[PDB]
């Protein structure tokens, strides 16, 4: 892949935090496939000028000098949300922070700066940040939609996902430790990725220090993925009776064997909202009454009219 | 603003939209209906076989004899006796109300008035489909294609000199091989013509045109003769009960020329004539989700094919995929027929352009809908509605705005149960909806072109023109064996005193409180309601569903001044046109 | 033969408008889609094993303002504007109130402001090589499209703002004296002012030649502008004019280009058709290009008027065999006919012929390609079937024959929206929906692209060999079919290989030369990228080798075309000397004419060095590398494969495939280097960007 191509995938591979220059040049050294050109104060100054030049890239000065990366082989998150904008990420100092763009380049992206004088101006306040599509293409990849709209939730994953290459992030840490939430609300923001097909599943063992070793799942995205080793029968809807005439109907012909809310979904051809009013109503009416019933996971409800 | 009661008893500020409707209708039907279209399709007296009673009894409706009922009117001394009258049998109008009910051998599902031009003074007819069976009931996937009856009524001719001791008299009827028919429109305008025009022997001078949606999934086209044409053919010895297999005038269907592959649209479910002139197009929704337009002039060897008796057979020039469910109804805009509007089982009413088919105008997303109108002087849509998934107590009917004026869906009448059908009447400016519950309700809409929210109370402006009731003295047998239906009427000649009058008070128990009865076969439901389109009789209503009773009404307290002068001067014009 | 290739490419949003989808002779597909355009390029990818289509994705946004038409002054429109809602007549209250070109935004309409219709340019329109989206919104903001970058989109006009100011700055009327300005407040004057530029459809002419190319846009009233664009196309810089013609059709519906040739006469004209139903060829006389002629008078093809809206026109060239002679066939899809015409011009003019092919949908047709090489149709409807419908010439003009491809049988029950066939006829894109199961409605509607196989393997292996345009880029749809085969079953099918080494025996022109390369990188993909390993060295030794001889031969054209132009003495813009010594390099150089011409040209250059210079060193490169150079400090610059020259430039143009790199022209550079490296890569035959 061409070098300039890396360099930019390097920047937009990081959030909206984006890198500091220490932090570009410990991630160019860090790639897998390794970085075509060999890093010298020269190439330096030569990818500062090709970056000063880009117009999506873009400048940050932040209130903190960064800690630099550890090293990764095996951030605080702070959610932006529903920004007006449309802008999507995790960034700490997103409200605090200030562009230094034009202090930097011209309106013709002309750099201000050499790399050593902007390091020596703002050492690692200077922050760089790719833009909103080169980020979230990034994420994507060339084969994926630009139209999808995730939630921020979601996007904040492929954040911290896309930033941690090949390398991942456990499904374990990550509700545990990253977003401090219960499985569920992690997995339930998760299966969308999957969905949309973004994202890989991984089976993948932990050994502790304490030499016992422990199961998690493991995630990587698209780019990055290396496999590790180790019965009613349905109503036509009639003409000349109402939904509920029909929908009573069907309960009372299933009478005291009943029928639960899912499967008289099924048994009308009605979406699940539209499925529930009709339970609700009839439940309303008191013409239907509701029993419980403990399957599989959940004590489901289904549904009896009161002639039984 | 204008203040004071009027005569009749209501506000003048809410009569004055009424008043108003009366001037805008006048205006448009001067400019956009005609007076004879389709010169061509006369009928003729040998495509009008009459069957025998041995032939006629497979199409007859079952029932021979309707449930019992009472009827009651306030402010008279209840009547109580039970009547039961035979298939075809109507009670005779009340002296003074003028109140005529009838049965038609089953439940009814289809209705409309004959259109009569303004000022005629026509003998005034409602052709109706009444369904084989009161407890059968058909799929929607289905291409039913079982025989029926097509029923025409006379209405006598509403005149008040004739309104006492009047009685609708079965004139006619069409034997229907095509299936159940869901839908009845006739030819809004130019089919008519004196029954005393002078023509030749084979010919008959035409009652009207008449379109029907079948089960069976096309579309029948009908010219009715005048009953007394067909009657001075016909051998006196005959039934006069007459039933006739008709041949069609023309036979619409999806398709084209060596269309091998039979269409998936299914049934036919709603109609709508272009309502303007020369009326040349018919548009028809179907059970697949598509609207589709025939041009009946059609000359064109591609859409028009002639059948080996001599009826056409049409297929469509347009067709467009307009829901993605069942096209429940269809309404065409009269101020400009390049719009229509449509509402369908995936519950968006779309607002649609015709010249630009693939994106409405506006699509606003709602409850179940049943039946649209779509009243000449207003922007809007009026929609009856289906309860199952209404926010609680807010289901009954909503005018609706297309949307340029931006106003909230105005509440117009709370109810509980579905409202089956709707109608409007230009004329009055007034609508009237039938219920499940089965009350019939009619309201008077507020200027539209100003904002409802203005409206502090809109129960001041319906009232229920009649309820009916099961008095106990899952089938039809097991139900009359052990109810009777009790008809109450208001009394429609004033509003005086309304929201005192019981029938309100009750009314006001209908909406809101009223517990839906779901066991047993809702026998009082009223499945259609129309008020009249003519002028001639503008201020009566027809209405009647599961029951199989049809009723009439006059509402006595809208017919007004300007509507006996409009009368009398269409009148004198019409007398000065045709002698 | 017809099979669903692997992925189905989802859709975010509703499908929207008219004949919404279309493949380019770019061979990217777009979506008109009710929030955005969704465009699918398919890419022959030689650098991953996966079987499937290639498609990278990209979209144009929906325009976020809503477009308003300029029919007067704001205050002057305002009053007009609150005249007509005011209006007591229900007729021209509920006229303005309903029709939403006066309404384009309101308080409670919804915003209308996704896309109505697009059309793809020719190839060559761009900026670069590649071909411009025109896109029109559902609001009439007619816009022109170009992706400059691979990212991203970008607005290069928006024609209603410009075209709005011209009738503005002449008070709505074409000729001043013909009809002087009627007053705003007559509503059919009103209305008349929105007519007149409300855009119906819009097509682009084939290439004129300075290249040009014509965008037709049909309005509403039956005008047409024709703006005739400067290539290649940049901006409102390049709008040389904009003529607008009256057809005095009531109601059109469609356009296309009838654009013909006979003996040395180039014809064209616009076809256009009613909404009622004819269809009339009109003469556009209103162009620059001396090589064109226009058709002598207006003729009309259909007549008849019966109200079947001619939803959809296509055209092909067709070589007639028993007439011996070119003609042009005419095809539109009207209702659910399809009508066809063709014309065949002789010394009695236009000779010309129509019918109606009948029987072939129970419902209107809903989306119309043909194959422009073959003359083969397709016709779509909602109902989901699908007709193959093949012309037959027969002594005078043709017949049709047709045949059903059973979508049921590759997709189940199924809603098809649109169909395009693509430029080489091998795949047929379809949009799907689910269908109706048995008589029920599905409960959710999911729109996605679909895309099945119109021809086996040999034939597309056929139509390669004996290409006629002889140039993979134009043939990636066929060449697909190629590369599906080879990564299915792991080896070159050896007809194709004999054939091809016959065809470099015989001919050895360099499209063959090319197509070995791919096969080779297919193969060299398909066995994953031990024995195997052993293929894989030899097979990258061959890869190697016919990159070599790609190289020499290209070397051969730069190193004549320096030869033949005037010697730059500063050996600007070429490594020549460097040229020279890679074709001195090697004794396998047996080519006598390279050997002499080094010879010319080494006496021609200049004995001065002139070396090029690592710009972070201002240090010589020798040209040490075929793919790249390095300093004495050992960082890299790549290589330039159109002009060897060094790419020490902050920005360098990558082609397609990412298989190659050149420079941009400078203006240092002279015309003739300026038209090598605009350019096709060497090794792929595909925009270098
Ligand atoms: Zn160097
Ligand atoms: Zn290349």
Not at chain 1, 232 to 253: A, C, G, K, N, S
Not at chain 3, 128 to 147: E, F, K, V
Not at chain 3, 503 to 511: L, Q
């Given at each position: 892949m061409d070098a300039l191509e890396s360099l930019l995938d390097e920047v937009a591979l990081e959030g909206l935090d984006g890198l500091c220059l220490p932090a570009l040049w410990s991630r160019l050294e860090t790639r897998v496939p390794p970085f075509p050109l060999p890093l010298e104060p020269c190439t330096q100054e030569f990818l500062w000028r090709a970056l000063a030049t880009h117009p999506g890239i873009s400048f940050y000065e932040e209130p903190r000098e960064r800690p630099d990366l550890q090293l990764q082989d095996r951030y605080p998150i702070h959610m932006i949300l529903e920004n007006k904008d449309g802008i999507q990420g995790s960034c700490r100092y997103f409200k605090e922070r200030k562009n230094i763009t034009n202090d930097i380049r011209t309106k013709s992206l002309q750099p201000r700066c050499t790399m050593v004088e902007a390091f020596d101006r703002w050492g690692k306040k200077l922050i760089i940040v790719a833009s909103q599509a080169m980020r979230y293409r990034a994420l994507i990849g060339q084969e994926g939609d630009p139209d999808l709209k995730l939630p921020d939730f979601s996007y904040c994953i492929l954040e911290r996902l896309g930033r941690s290459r090949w390398q991942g992030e456990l499904q374990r840490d990550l509700h545990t430790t990253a977003f401090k939430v219960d499985a569920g609300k992690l997995h339930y923001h998760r299966k969308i990725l999957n969905k949309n097909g973004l994202i890989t599943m991984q089976s993948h063992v932990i050994r502790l220090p304490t030499g016992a070793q422990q199961h998690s799942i493991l995630l990587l995205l698209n780019r990055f993925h290396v496999d590790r080793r180790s019965t009613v029968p349905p109503v036509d809807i009639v003409f000349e009776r109402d939904m509920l005439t029909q929908t009573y109907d069907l309960i009372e012909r299933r009478g005291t064997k009943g029928i639960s809310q899912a499967e008289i979904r099924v048994a009308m051809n009605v979406g699940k909202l539209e499925a529930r009013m009709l339970c609700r109503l009839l439940q309303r009416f008191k013409v239907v009454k509701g029993f419980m019933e403990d399957e599989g996971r959940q004590r489901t409800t289904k549904y009896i009219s009161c002639v039984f | 603003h204008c203040r004071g009661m009027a005569p009749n008893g209501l506000p003048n500020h809410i009569m004055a939209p009424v008043w108003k409707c009366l001037h805008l209708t006048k205006d448009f039907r001067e400019q956009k209906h005609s007076y004879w279209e389709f010169a061509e399709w006369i009928p003729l007296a040998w495509k009008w076989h009459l069957l025998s009673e041995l032939e006629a009894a497979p199409y007859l409706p079952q029932e021979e004899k309707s449930p019992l009922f009472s009827v009651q009117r306030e402010g008279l001394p209840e009547d109580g006796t039970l009547y039961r009258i035979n298939r075809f049998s109507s009670i005779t109008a009340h002296p003074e109300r003028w109140d005529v009910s009838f049965f038609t051998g089953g439940p009814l599902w289809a209705l409309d008035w004959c259109p009569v031009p303004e000022g005629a003074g026509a003998s005034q007819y409602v052709a109706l489909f009444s369904s084989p069976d009161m407890n059968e009931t058909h799929p929607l996937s289905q291409l039913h294609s079982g025989p029926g009856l097509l029923q025409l009524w006379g209405l006598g001719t509403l005149q008040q000199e004739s309104c006492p001791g009047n009685r609708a008299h079965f004139v006619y009827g069409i034997a229907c091989?095509?299936?159940?028919?869901?839908d009845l429109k006739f030819c809004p305008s130019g089919a008519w013509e004196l029954p005393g025009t002078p023509r030749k022997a084979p010919l008959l001078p035409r009652l009207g045109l008449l379109a029907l949606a079948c089960s069976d999934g096309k579309v029948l086209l009908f010219s009715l003769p005048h009953p007394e044409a067909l009657l001075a053919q016909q051998p006196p010895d005959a039934v006069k009960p007459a039933i006739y297999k008709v041949q069609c005038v023309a036979t619409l269907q999806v398709g084209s020329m060596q269309a091998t592959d039979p269409s998936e649209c299914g049934q036919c479910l709603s109609l709508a004539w272009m309502p303007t002139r020369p009326h040349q197009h018919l548009a028809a929704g179907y059970y697949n989700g598509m609207v589709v337009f025939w041009n009946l002039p059609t000359n064109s060897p591609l859409q028009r094919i002639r059948l080996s008796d001599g009826s056409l057979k049409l297929y469509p020039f347009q067709c467009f995929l307009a829901h993605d469910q069942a096209v429940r109804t269809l309404q065409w805009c009269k101020a400009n027929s390049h719009f229509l509007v449509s509402a369908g089982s995936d519950r968006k009413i779309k607002f649609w352009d015709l010249r630009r088919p693939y994106e409405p105008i506006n699509s606003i997303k709602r409850f179940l809908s049943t039946e649209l109108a779509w009243l000449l002087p207003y922007n809007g849509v009026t929609v009856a509605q289906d309860n199952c998934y209404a926010s609680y107590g807010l289901c009954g009917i909503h005018y609706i705005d297309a949307g340029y004026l931006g106003f909230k869906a105005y509440f117009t009448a709370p109810r509980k149960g579905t409202v089956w059908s709707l109608s409007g009447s230009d004329w009055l400016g007034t609508i009237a909806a039938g219920d499940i519950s089965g009350e019939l309700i009619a309201a008077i809409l507020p200027d539209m072109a100003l904002n409802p929210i203005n409206v502090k109370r809109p129960v001041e402006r319906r009232f229920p023109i009649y309820k009916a009731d099961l008095i106990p003295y899952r089938t039809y047998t097991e139900t009359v064996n052990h109810h009777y239906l009790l008809f109450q009427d208001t009394d429609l000649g004033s509003f005086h005193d309304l929201l005192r009058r019981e029938p309100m008070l009750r009314m006001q128990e209908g909406e809101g409180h009223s517990q839906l009865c779901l066991d047993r076969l809702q026998l009082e439901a009223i499945h259609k309601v129309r008020f009249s389109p003519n002028l001639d009789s503008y201020g009566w209503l027809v209405s009647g569903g599961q029951s199989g009773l049809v009723r009439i009404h006059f509402v006595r307290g809208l017919a007004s001044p300007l509507g006996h002068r409009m009368q009398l001067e269409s009148r004198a014009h019409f007398n000065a046109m045709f002698q | 033969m017809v099979t669903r290739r692997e992925p189905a490419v989802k859709l975010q949003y509703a499908v929207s408008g008219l004949e919404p989808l279309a493949w380019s002779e770019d061979h990217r597909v777009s979506v008109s889609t009710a929030r955005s355009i969704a465009v699918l390029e398919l890419i022959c990818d030689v650098h991953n094993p996966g079987q499937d289509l290639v498609i990278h994705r990209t979209s144009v946004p929906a325009p976020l303002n809503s477009c308003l038409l300029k029919v007067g002054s704001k205050t002057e429109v305002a009053e007009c504007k609150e005249k007509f809602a005011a209006s007591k007549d229900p007729t021209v209250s509920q006229t303005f109130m309903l029709d939403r070109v006066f309404n384009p935004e309101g308080k409670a309409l919804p915003p209308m402001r996704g896309f109505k219709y697009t059309s793809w340019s020719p190839m060559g329109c761009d900026a670069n090589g590649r071909c411009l989206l025109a896109a029109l919104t559902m609001d009439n903001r007619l816009t022109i499209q170009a992706n400059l970058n691979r990212l991203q989109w970008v607005q290069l006009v928006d024609l209603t703002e410009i075209y709005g100011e011209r009738l503005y700055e002449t008070s709505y009327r074409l000729s001043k004296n013909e009809a002087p300005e009627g007053n705003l407040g007559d509503f059919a004057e009103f209305q008349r002012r929105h007519s007149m530029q409300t855009p119906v459809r819009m097509e682009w002419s084939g290439i004129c030649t300075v290249g040009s190319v014509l965008l037709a846009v049909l309005f509403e009233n039956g005008n047409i502008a024709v703006w005739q664009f400067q290539l290649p196309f940049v901006g409102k810089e390049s709008i040389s004019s904009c003529n607008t013609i009256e057809s005095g059709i009531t109601s059109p519906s469609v356009l296309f280009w009838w654009e013909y040739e006979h003996n040395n006469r180039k014809m064209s004209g616009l076809i256009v058709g009613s909404a009622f139903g004819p269809i009339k060829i009109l003469p556009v006389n209103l162009k620059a290009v001396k090589g064109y002629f226009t058709l002598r008078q207006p003729v009309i093809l259909?007549?008849?008027?019966?109200?079947?809206?001619?939803h959809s026109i296509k055209c092909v060239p067709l070589y007639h065999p028993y007439q011996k002679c070119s003609c042009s066939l005419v095809v539109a899809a009207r209702g659910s006919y399809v009508f066809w015409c063709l014309l065949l011009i002789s010394k009695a003019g236009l000779n010309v012929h129509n019918s109606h092919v009948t029987g072939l949908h129970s419902l209107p047709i809903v989306s119309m390609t043909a194959d422009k090489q073959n003359g083969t149709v397709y016709t779509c409807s909602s109902d989901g079937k699908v007709r193959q419908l093949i012309p037959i010439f027969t002594d005078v003009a043709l017949k049709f024959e047709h045949q059903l491809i059973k979508l049921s049988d590759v997709f189940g029950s199924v809603r098809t929206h649109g169909i395009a066939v693509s430029p080489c006829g091998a795949y047929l894109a379809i949009i799907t929906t689910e269908g109706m199961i048995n008589g029920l409605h599905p409960v959710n509607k999911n729109y996605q692209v679909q895309f099945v196989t119109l021809k086996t393997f040999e034939e597309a292996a056929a139509q390669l060999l004996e290409s006629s345009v002889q140039n993979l880029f134009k043939q990636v749809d066929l060449i697909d079919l190629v590369r599906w085969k080879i990564l299915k079953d792991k080896h070159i099918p050896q007809f194709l290989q004999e054939a091809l080494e016959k065809k470099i025996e015989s001919s050895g022109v360099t499209y063959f030369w090319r197509f070995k390369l791919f096969l080779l990188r297919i193969l060299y993909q398909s066995m994953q990228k031990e024995p195997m390993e052993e293929k894989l060295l030899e097979i990258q030794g061959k890869i190697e080798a016919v990159e070599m001889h790609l190289t020499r031969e290209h070397m051969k054209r730069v190193l004549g075309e320096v030869y033949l132009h005037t010697w730059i003495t500063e050996n600007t813009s070429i490594p020549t000397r460097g040229l020279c010594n890679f074709l001195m390099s090697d004794e396998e150089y047996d080519d006598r004419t390279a050997r002499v011409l080094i010879g010319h040209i080494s006496k021609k250059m200049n004995k001065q060095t002139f070396p090029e210079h690592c710009s972070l060193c201002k240090e010589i490169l020798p040209f040490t590398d075929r793919k790249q150079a390095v300093c004495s400090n050992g960082h890299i610059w790549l290589r330039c494969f159109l002009t060897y020259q060094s790419c020490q430039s902050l920005i360098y143009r990558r082609c397609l495939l990412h298989d190659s790199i050149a420079r941009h022209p400078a203006p240092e550079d002279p015309d003739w280097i300026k038209r090598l490296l605009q350019s096709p890569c060497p090794f792929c035959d595909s925009p270098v960007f």
């Amino acid at each position: 892949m061409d070098a300039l191509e890396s360099l930019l995938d390097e920047v937009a591979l990081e959030g909206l935090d984006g890198l500091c220059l220490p932090a570009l040049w410990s991630r160019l050294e860090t790639r897998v496939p390794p970085f075509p050109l060999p890093l010298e104060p020269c190439t330096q100054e030569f990818l500062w000028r090709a970056l000063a030049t880009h117009p999506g890239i873009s400048f940050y000065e932040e209130p903190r000098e960064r800690p630099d990366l550890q090293l990764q082989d095996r951030y605080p998150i702070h959610m932006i949300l529903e920004n007006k904008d449309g802008i999507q990420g995790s960034c700490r100092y997103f409200k605090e922070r200030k562009n230094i763009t034009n202090d930097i380049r011209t309106k013709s992206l002309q750099p201000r700066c050499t790399m050593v004088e902007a390091f020596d101006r703002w050492g690692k306040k200077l922050i760089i940040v790719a833009s909103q599509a080169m980020r979230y293409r990034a994420l994507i990849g060339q084969e994926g939609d630009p139209d999808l709209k995730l939630p921020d939730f979601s996007y904040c994953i492929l954040e911290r996902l896309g930033r941690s290459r090949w390398q991942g992030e456990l499904q374990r840490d990550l509700h545990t430790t990253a977003f401090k939430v219960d499985a569920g609300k992690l997995h339930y923001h998760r299966k969308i990725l999957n969905k949309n097909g973004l994202i890989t599943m991984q089976s993948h063992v932990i050994r502790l220090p304490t030499g016992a070793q422990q199961h998690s799942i493991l995630l990587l995205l698209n780019r990055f993925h290396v496999d590790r080793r180790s019965t009613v029968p349905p109503v036509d809807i009639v003409f000349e009776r109402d939904m509920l005439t029909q929908t009573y109907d069907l309960i009372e012909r299933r009478g005291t064997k009943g029928i639960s809310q899912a499967e008289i979904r099924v048994a009308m051809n009605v979406g699940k909202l539209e499925a529930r009013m009709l339970c609700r109503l009839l439940q309303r009416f008191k013409v239907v009454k509701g029993f419980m019933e403990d399957e599989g996971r959940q004590r489901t409800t289904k549904y009896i009219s009161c002639v039984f | 603003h204008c203040r004071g009661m009027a005569p009749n008893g209501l506000p003048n500020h809410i009569m004055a939209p009424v008043w108003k409707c009366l001037h805008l209708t006048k205006d448009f039907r001067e400019q956009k209906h005609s007076y004879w279209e389709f010169a061509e399709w006369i009928p003729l007296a040998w495509k009008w076989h009459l069957l025998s009673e041995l032939e006629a009894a497979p199409y007859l409706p079952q029932e021979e004899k309707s449930p019992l009922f009472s009827v009651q009117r306030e402010g008279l001394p209840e009547d109580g006796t039970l009547y039961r009258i035979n298939r075809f049998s109507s009670i005779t109008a009340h002296p003074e109300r003028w109140d005529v009910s009838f049965f038609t051998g089953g439940p009814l599902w289809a209705l409309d008035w004959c259109p009569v031009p303004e000022g005629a003074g026509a003998s005034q007819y409602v052709a109706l489909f009444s369904s084989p069976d009161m407890n059968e009931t058909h799929p929607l996937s289905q291409l039913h294609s079982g025989p029926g009856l097509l029923q025409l009524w006379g209405l006598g001719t509403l005149q008040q000199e004739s309104c006492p001791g009047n009685r609708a008299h079965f004139v006619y009827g069409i034997a229907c091989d095509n299936g159940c028919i869901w839908d009845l429109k006739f030819c809004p305008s130019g089919a008519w013509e004196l029954p005393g025009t002078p023509r030749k022997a084979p010919l008959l001078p035409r009652l009207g045109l008449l379109a029907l949606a079948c089960s069976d999934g096309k579309v029948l086209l009908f010219s009715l003769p005048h009953p007394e044409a067909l009657l001075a053919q016909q051998p006196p010895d005959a039934v006069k009960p007459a039933i006739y297999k008709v041949q069609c005038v023309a036979t619409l269907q999806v398709g084209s020329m060596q269309a091998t592959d039979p269409s998936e649209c299914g049934q036919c479910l709603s109609l709508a004539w272009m309502p303007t002139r020369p009326h040349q197009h018919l548009a028809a929704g179907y059970y697949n989700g598509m609207v589709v337009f025939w041009n009946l002039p059609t000359n064109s060897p591609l859409q028009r094919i002639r059948l080996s008796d001599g009826s056409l057979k049409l297929y469509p020039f347009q067709c467009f995929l307009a829901h993605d469910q069942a096209v429940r109804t269809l309404q065409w805009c009269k101020a400009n027929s390049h719009f229509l509007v449509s509402a369908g089982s995936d519950r968006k009413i779309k607002f649609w352009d015709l010249r630009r088919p693939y994106e409405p105008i506006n699509s606003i997303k709602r409850f179940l809908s049943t039946e649209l109108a779509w009243l000449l002087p207003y922007n809007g849509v009026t929609v009856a509605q289906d309860n199952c998934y209404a926010s609680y107590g807010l289901c009954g009917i909503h005018y609706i705005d297309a949307g340029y004026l931006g106003f909230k869906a105005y509440f117009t009448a709370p109810r509980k149960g579905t409202v089956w059908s709707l109608s409007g009447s230009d004329w009055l400016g007034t609508i009237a909806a039938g219920d499940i519950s089965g009350e019939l309700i009619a309201a008077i809409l507020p200027d539209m072109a100003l904002n409802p929210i203005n409206v502090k109370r809109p129960v001041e402006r319906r009232f229920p023109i009649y309820k009916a009731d099961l008095i106990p003295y899952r089938t039809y047998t097991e139900t009359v064996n052990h109810h009777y239906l009790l008809f109450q009427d208001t009394d429609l000649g004033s509003f005086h005193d309304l929201l005192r009058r019981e029938p309100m008070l009750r009314m006001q128990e209908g909406e809101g409180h009223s517990q839906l009865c779901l066991d047993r076969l809702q026998l009082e439901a009223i499945h259609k309601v129309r008020f009249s389109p003519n002028l001639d009789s503008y201020g009566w209503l027809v209405s009647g569903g599961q029951s199989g009773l049809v009723r009439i009404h006059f509402v006595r307290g809208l017919a007004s001044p300007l509507g006996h002068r409009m009368q009398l001067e269409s009148r004198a014009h019409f007398n000065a046109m045709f002698q | 033969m017809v099979t669903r290739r692997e992925p189905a490419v989802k859709l975010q949003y509703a499908v929207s408008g008219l004949e919404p989808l279309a493949w380019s002779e770019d061979h990217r597909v777009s979506v008109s889609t009710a929030r955005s355009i969704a465009v699918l390029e398919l890419i022959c990818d030689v650098h991953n094993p996966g079987q499937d289509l290639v498609i990278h994705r990209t979209s144009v946004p929906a325009p976020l303002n809503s477009c308003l038409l300029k029919v007067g002054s704001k205050t002057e429109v305002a009053e007009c504007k609150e005249k007509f809602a005011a209006s007591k007549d229900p007729t021209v209250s509920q006229t303005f109130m309903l029709d939403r070109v006066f309404n384009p935004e309101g308080k409670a309409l919804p915003p209308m402001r996704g896309f109505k219709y697009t059309s793809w340019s020719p190839m060559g329109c761009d900026a670069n090589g590649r071909c411009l989206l025109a896109a029109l919104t559902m609001d009439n903001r007619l816009t022109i499209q170009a992706n400059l970058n691979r990212l991203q989109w970008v607005q290069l006009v928006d024609l209603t703002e410009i075209y709005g100011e011209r009738l503005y700055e002449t008070s709505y009327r074409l000729s001043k004296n013909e009809a002087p300005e009627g007053n705003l407040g007559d509503f059919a004057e009103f209305q008349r002012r929105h007519s007149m530029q409300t855009p119906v459809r819009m097509e682009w002419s084939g290439i004129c030649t300075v290249g040009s190319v014509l965008l037709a846009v049909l309005f509403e009233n039956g005008n047409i502008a024709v703006w005739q664009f400067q290539l290649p196309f940049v901006g409102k810089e390049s709008i040389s004019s904009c003529n607008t013609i009256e057809s005095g059709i009531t109601s059109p519906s469609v356009l296309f280009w009838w654009e013909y040739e006979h003996n040395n006469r180039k014809m064209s004209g616009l076809i256009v058709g009613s909404a009622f139903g004819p269809i009339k060829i009109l003469p556009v006389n209103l162009k620059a290009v001396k090589g064109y002629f226009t058709l002598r008078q207006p003729v009309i093809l259909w007549k008849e008027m019966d109200q079947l809206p001619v939803h959809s026109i296509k055209c092909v060239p067709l070589y007639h065999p028993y007439q011996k002679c070119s003609c042009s066939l005419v095809v539109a899809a009207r209702g659910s006919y399809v009508f066809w015409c063709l014309l065949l011009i002789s010394k009695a003019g236009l000779n010309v012929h129509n019918s109606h092919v009948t029987g072939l949908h129970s419902l209107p047709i809903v989306s119309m390609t043909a194959d422009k090489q073959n003359g083969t149709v397709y016709t779509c409807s909602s109902d989901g079937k699908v007709r193959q419908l093949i012309p037959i010439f027969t002594d005078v003009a043709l017949k049709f024959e047709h045949q059903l491809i059973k979508l049921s049988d590759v997709f189940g029950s199924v809603r098809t929206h649109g169909i395009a066939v693509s430029p080489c006829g091998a795949y047929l894109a379809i949009i799907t929906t689910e269908g109706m199961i048995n008589g029920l409605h599905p409960v959710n509607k999911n729109y996605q692209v679909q895309f099945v196989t119109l021809k086996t393997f040999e034939e597309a292996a056929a139509q390669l060999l004996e290409s006629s345009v002889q140039n993979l880029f134009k043939q990636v749809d066929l060449i697909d079919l190629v590369r599906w085969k080879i990564l299915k079953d792991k080896h070159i099918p050896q007809f194709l290989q004999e054939a091809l080494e016959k065809k470099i025996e015989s001919s050895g022109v360099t499209y063959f030369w090319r197509f070995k390369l791919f096969l080779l990188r297919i193969l060299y993909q398909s066995m994953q990228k031990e024995p195997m390993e052993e293929k894989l060295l030899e097979i990258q030794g061959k890869i190697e080798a016919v990159e070599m001889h790609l190289t020499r031969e290209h070397m051969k054209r730069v190193l004549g075309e320096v030869y033949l132009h005037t010697w730059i003495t500063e050996n600007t813009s070429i490594p020549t000397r460097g040229l020279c010594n890679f074709l001195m390099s090697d004794e396998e150089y047996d080519d006598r004419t390279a050997r002499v011409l080094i010879g010319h040209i080494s006496k021609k250059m200049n004995k001065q060095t002139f070396p090029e210079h690592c710009s972070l060193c201002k240090e010589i490169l020798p040209f040490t590398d075929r793919k790249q150079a390095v300093c004495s400090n050992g960082h890299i610059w790549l290589r330039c494969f159109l002009t060897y020259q060094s790419c020490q430039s902050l920005i360098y143009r990558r082609c397609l495939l990412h298989d190659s790199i050149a420079r941009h022209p400078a203006p240092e550079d002279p015309d003739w280097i300026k038209r090598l490296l605009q350019s096709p890569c060497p090794f792929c035959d595909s925009p270098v960007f």
